[PDB]
Amino acid sequence: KGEELFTGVVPILVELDGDVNGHKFSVSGEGEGDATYGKLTLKFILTTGKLPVPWPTLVTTLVQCFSRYPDHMKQHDFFKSAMPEGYVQERTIFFKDDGNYKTRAEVKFEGDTLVNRIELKGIDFKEDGNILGHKLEYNYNCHNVYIMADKQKNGIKVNFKIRHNIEDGSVQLADHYQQNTPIGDGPVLLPDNHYLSTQSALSKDPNEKRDHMVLLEFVTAAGI
Structure with a gap:
């Protein structure tokens, strides 16, 4: 419930x-979430001086329970079924012609503040590579997230490729593969095969002098 x-x-x-x-x-991000309209506003600040990668490099790592499932789709909204006890979101991101990120996280409630706790380890990246080189444009397209149930893990599996527009013109591919798993032993929901239309707008707080990211995102569920 x-x-x-x-x-x-x-x-x-x-x-x-x-x-x-x-x-x-x-x-350290803090903002708000409106499930109803699928709306997400966030300001992300870098504690430590300056970032070794360019922020887009993982908007995806930085709360899919904040998606609008249409009333005819409620029966497939897994991420909210796990709540408040929450879910582990395990992701591996191979960046074609470059190294890879490896991320675990516990999205759960804490009084009222839904919190995404993420550890993330990265390897094999060439120190000219578009990523470490900072050649990637400070923008982000819309993308489709494909959800398929997994009664094995008791939760769901997910896939989606991301397009990073380079300063040159060409597109850096990112192959995302994602398992989600409830932290609770309370009743959860297994979905039919369906996708999420995630749209995302990056920008910069003019006062803010620390390496930071304002992200505003619209995400809605579709394919049934």
Whole structure:
């Protein structure tokens, strides 16, 4: 009976212990979520001076329980079925012609503040590579997230490729593969095969002098 928590505005808090090629950092977002309209506003600040990668490199890592499932789709809203006890979101991201990220996280409630707790380890990246080179444009397209049930794990499996527009013109591919698993032993929901239309707008707080990211995102469910 979890989706009952998501009927209004629920503040988000996201913490990211981060390391790529031994270049370490930690990021701290806070904003809000409106399930109803699928709306997501966030300001992400870099604790530690400057980021070794370019922010887009993982908007995807930095709360899919904040998606609008249409009333005719409620029966397939897994992420809210796990709540408040929450789910583990395990993801591996191979960046074609470059190394890879490896991320675990516990999205759960804490009083009222839904919190995404992420550790993320990265390897094999060439130190000219578009990623470490900072050649990627400070933007982001819309993408389709494909959900398929997995009664094995008791939860769901997910896939989606991301297009990063390079400063040159060409597109850096990112192959995302994602398992989600409830932390609770309470009743959850297994979905039919369906996708999420995730749209996302990056920008910069003019006062803010710390390496940071304003992200505003619309995500809705479709394919049934």
